[PDB]
From a paper:
Reactions 1 and 4 are catalyzed by two Fe2+-dependent dioxygenases: TML dioxygenase (TMLD) and γ-butyrobetaine dioxygenase (BBD), which are related by homology; reaction 3 is catalyzed by trimethylamino butyraldehyde dehydrogenase (TMABADH); reaction 2, the aldol cleavage of HTML to generate glycine and TMABA, is catalyzed by HTMLA. However, a mouse protein absent in humans (threonine aldolase; [name]) catalyzes the reaction more efficiently. However, the preferred substrate of [name] is HTML with a catalytic efficiency in the order of 104 s−1 M−1, followed by L-allo-threonine (102 s−1 M−1) and L-threonine (101 s−1 M−1). As we found that the mouse enzyme has a strong preference (1000 folds) for HTML towards threonine, the name hydroxytrimethyllysine aldolase (Htmla) would be a better descriptor of the mouse gene.
To verify if the results of our screening for [name] are confirmed or improved with the availability of an experimental structure, we decided to determine the crystal structure of mouse [name]. Mouse [name] crystallizes in two space groups, in orthorhombic F222 and in monoclinic C2, with one molecule and two molecules in the ASU, respectively. The PLP cofactor is visible only in the monoclinic structure; however, the active site is very similar in the two cases, with only minor differences. In [name], the PLP cofactor, bound to Lys242, is stabilized in the active site by a network of hydrogen bonds and salt bridges with the side chains of Asp211, Arg214 and Thr98 from the same unit, and of Lys267 and Arg274 from the adjacent unit. His123 is making an aromatic stacking interaction with the PLP pyridine ring with a relative distance between the rings of 3.7 Å. The expected tetrameric quaternary structure is formed by crystallographic symmetries, with four identical units in F222 (related by a 222 symmetry) and two identical dimers in C2 (related by a two-fold axis). The RMSD values between the single units (around 0.26–0.28 Å) indicate that the monoclinic and orthorhombic structures are similar. As indicate by data from PISA analysis, the interface between units A and B (analogous to that between units C and D, termed “main interface”) is contributing stronger to the stability of the quaternary structure in comparison with the interface between units A and C (analogous to that between units B and D, termed “secondary interface”). Hence, the tetramer can be considered a dimer (AB + CD) of dimers (A + B and C + D), with the first dissociation being ABCD to AB + CD (as determined by PISA). As a consequence, the tetrameric assembly of the mouse enzyme has a lower stability, with a ΔGdiss (the free energy of assembly dissociation) value of 5–6 kcal/mol compared to the 40.9 kcal/mol of the bacterial enzyme (for the ABCD to AB + CD dissociation).
Author numbering:
A (entry chain B), B (entry chain A), C (entry chain B), D (entry chain A): 39 to 400
């Protein structure tokens, strides 16, 4: 048995998705003739509260397009977080493709930026021609590096007021925006109301194989077409991929709560072990991610034992569970849940954790 | 009835493709865990005679990655054709994304570059620190703007000898490389032997919904991984798309000849009309493209009548055929054939052409 | 003795210039406090018929700033000549710094672009989102690679009408704009009336050691300040350099005619030699440049003998004149006159030419 | 009377400089024919312990060239300080011109980077293909935003050891490197030994009108020639500017100590006032900069009164001193000394400060 808790991208297509792709009325998206792409775009337009949307291959390109479509002035700056995906895990494309300066701000605890330091950054070069013009504030809901932490609607409101005052636009990396709205029990459009543009991934928690989109005003999405074309994302018969995305877009309000519940149950069960090696605050688990603090054991070696299977595991637990994880920081590991991790898989991992912890118990 | 001859991109998935997508063993390609992507990559590596390949969303990104991975020096130049796809229909991404200077050379007749002007250009900045360092010679086989003209193997050899002498690499835009190998009756690797890297489109004549790849040495493809990731093409479960691509890769050497025959038959049938309005030399038709010279009628109005249907069309011909075409030059229109145009569709178009020409015969 | 006819950049400061630099009321140009910079900027503003000007280190940066300030849209194109300085001798900075696509057009004979091919290029992507947006037409008066050929006021008018129709701006590389206006006997502002922006070099024919400027509307020059700052041209006490430039700006209408007369006299004297090796049409000499066609002798080797001095030269001519030149094409060499070449130096070179030609006379 | 303490850039040419410019043996530096440029370059090479140097218009271009010549890989990162000049006051040219990602680290107190956060950053993407390749560590000696704080030789050594271990190069922004070497009483080459490249400004404390240079190995400076040419800094007769630079380079080890003494004396005199409004620790004054902490008064209004002159100022002090200063932070102002501020000017400022403080003493 294998429980892959490394990321929510490993979701494989389900039966409904696989048929939807093969039963998809397709066309040339470059000519604007794929109806299944057109459906996904307009369904997500109402879901996200934006005028238009634009299907893109990845959410990485979705962010790259947004930065390029907002930060167009030569000498423009984006205000972003120090541990957001755009700054860390996107090859620095803000500079090597967009040519836009980045001023990162701290946000590690709760995925939020200090609105005082935001005001300080938005005002330092508010008019001076000696400083780059900050034209975009980049937010991440949920924040992946912080542990899937939800950004409150109130924090979203304040950021925009501060940004829109100093003449800057607001984009939200909504790679896990459905996870945030599921946790807050609010419609997803209430989080995007306080934004100019948004990104949205289908390949993560929703279960789709490939797909993402940019959302915003009709003009911003119209300018986004040329940027998607130039970056290499002008696919032809992409209604094959939009069909599976439409299925997961409809199954979000029933699949994602299960991943949050499995995350909470795991965090509780791991806390009920009281081990000096591993510590988890079940209240930090806001969505489908559990950040486990490891002490005394290198996070890489803990993952190695959770993935390994020994005869003694079959002695105490009875099963052979290979728990797959990623070491996140130097003292922590990250587990992420999805629709392909069952609730009994969650219990199987907890028992694998029990065995592993006891073997390395101080 | 409707015959879409605007481009070979409008190829829609067949039943075998649609089943292959839904029956695909998929995984996270970003982690290198999609086996169907690995299969398509390894099959095309042997087909093209390259060490490795890399599945990308479009051939536009495949070309962009090749330029970026070859023209890396600050102050680098690419030698390309004046009417090649990279120079005209890719939003100038060689400059706005790659930051690479372009020196275009004429290529309109046969898709070939004058080896004298190439040698002169390769020598002007061979050592001078006042000129950019030419690091890539960009070729297009087949050449789309010229009418799918095939580049001879000997011409390919000479270009490399001239380039490899002055320390430049050779990339071939093989968006229609399978069409070239079918016309030349040679395996595709014999055209790529005289290259460092190559591009290869699946979404055109091969019938796939989405997909392309970059080919070359293992080192070049390893550098291509970061460029695909940074440009936004690092998809996750892309074995869904690779599965349909594998079907078209196996059906190419039997589907594309039918498209060449339909193109030749159409050009002949148009030549057997002897009309002063339209003229086509059936010897210029080397592949699946027919460049029709228009006289007396603006090329846009010819396309409008071929798509339109009138009561008199049902009087003279008996059917209602909507032939879809794109005006190409100021005095010509471009027709491109694919697997979704049947041989009787070609005859239906020829009859629609007859009617249109006869109404405005002067 | 030495007559350097390689370029007009080798002009060394005169006595009036050297005192003007040492007697210059200077200040911090970055703070806008250098009055000698302010004087040169406003004097050139009236001279060129522009609202404002901006002193820059080189004319290379002046062009780079103009392209950046006009071609600001992501996916913008500049229409320029194939043998203009921006395309050939500026390290392809239109792409590697500005990130702007370049569509070069032929202009070799008279430095003019075929207005039909200009219309064709300005219309091909006039609205299509598949093509880059042409936002700048780049002209060169005089054209250096063509042999200092003057662009007529009428040709300037037509280009602008064609450009301003399709919503593009016009910049003129006026590195030798005073040479053009001196030849046409018109004030320099009459050539810039048909332009949006202009460049202007002081280090060439005017005699200054360092300096250039960008001219245009007050907004374009205000946006140019940030671009000059970012590229590294925000000098501090540059009134030292502006003072020498103001001297040459006042001495242009008395120094430059002498360089044109010496060029014509040389071309005549060389034509009155009737040598099969060298040929010069004295009517192609429009300004201070003479393009000498060489046949039977590699242009590099002719320059080597003109620079060399032998005992036999002292036998036939009596003097030891080292004529310094540049081989320009594969069958031509380029001579350029300036204020540091005297009229007797011109006669000394012609005699050195006589001797050299006779030694290699077929 | 007027004391300009806003920056050390306002240094105006002295008589020896003004004579040196007018007595300069100049030539075309682009052809490598300006001997005075060659002299300044060779003298600074021995002074800084580098193989070669390259005269550039500004130190902004010198830094831009260094970043471009080090951070050349597509997907490269520079490790720099959060308040360093490259990150704040250079229009983000690291991205909008160089296309290089920036990971800034805190440095506000002592201008030093936390070697733990540096090691952590140098290891996060030491091999991972998901992270940009860190190729340059950027240091600033002295650190301008921190108040001219000197970086110790030992701290410089450790940074290189950490960088050279993880395969990164070290560049030092030596805009005020002579101020650092005067404070440390060491030859300047001992600070540059722990570097690959360095920058060096002449227009600041040294007194020159215009000029700076890049230093490093012969190969790095050879690559710097094309970058200086492409950015627009390839001047012709720059021995005019190099001549004045040679004067300040020889007068540095006797002029800069006077500026350090005036800064210390001022800070002491301000400390001997014991005012609740303004506070300065004279031990933070390491060079020619005094960071004055302001309380109760917005820093802008303090500068307005120090520049203003009233009848009561002539009543209490007897003179009319206009002290020119820049508000630096939200609670501080920055004073910088240079050769054009005399020791009695410092006493006149201190008396102007006394008056201003006493009027608003609470
Ligand atoms: Na997925
Ligand atoms: Na297709
Ligand atoms: Na000069
Ligand atoms: Na100065």
């Amino acid at each position: 048995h294998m429980v892959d808790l490394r990321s929510d991208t490993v979701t494989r297509p389900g039966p409904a998705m696989r048929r939807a792709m093969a039963e998809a009325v397709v066309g040339d998206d470059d000519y604007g003739e794929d109806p299944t792409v057109h459906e996904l775009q307009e369904k997500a337009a109402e879901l996200l509260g934006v005028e238009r949307t634009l299907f893109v291959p990845t959410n990485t390109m979705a962010n790259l397009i947004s930065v390029m479509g907002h930060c167009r002035r030569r000498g423009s700056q984006v205000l972003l977080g120090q541990e957001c995906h755009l700054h860390v895990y996107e090859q620095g494309g803000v500079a090597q493709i967009a040519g836009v300066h980045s001023h990162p701000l701290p946000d590690l605890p709760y995925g939020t930026l200090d609105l005082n330091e935001l005001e300080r950054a938005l005002t330092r070069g508010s008019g001076s021609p000696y400083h780059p013009v900050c034209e975009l504030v980049y937010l991440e809901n949920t924040h992946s590096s912080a542990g899937g932490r939800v950004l409150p609607v109130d924090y979203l409101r304040q950021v925009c007021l501060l940004a829109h005052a100093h003449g800057a636009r607001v984009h939200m990396d909504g790679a896990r925006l459905m996870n945030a709205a599921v946790a807050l029990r609010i419609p997803p459009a209430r989080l995007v109301e306080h934004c100019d543009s948004v990104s949205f991934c289908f390949s993560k928690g929703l279960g789709a194989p490939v797909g993402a989109l940019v959302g915003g005003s009709k003009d911003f999405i119209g300018e986004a077409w040329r940027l998607r074309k130039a970056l290499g994302g002008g696919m032809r018969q992409a209604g094959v991929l939009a069909a599976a995305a439409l299925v997961g877009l409809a199954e979000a309000e029933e699949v994602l709560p299960r991943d949050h519940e499995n995350a909470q149950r795991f965090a509780k069960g791991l806390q009920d072990l009281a081990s000096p090696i591993c510590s988890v605050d079940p209240a930090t688990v806001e969505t489908n991610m559990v950040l486990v603090q490891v002490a005394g054991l290198p996070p890489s070696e803990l993952c190695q034992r959770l993935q390994a299977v020994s005869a003694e595991e079959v002695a105490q637990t009875g099963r052979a569970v290979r728990v797959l994880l990623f070491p996140w920081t130097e003292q922590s590991v990250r587990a992420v849940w999805h629709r392909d991790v069952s609730a009994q898989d969650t219990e199987l991992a907890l028992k694998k954790w029990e065995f592993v912890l006891r073997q390395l118990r101080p």
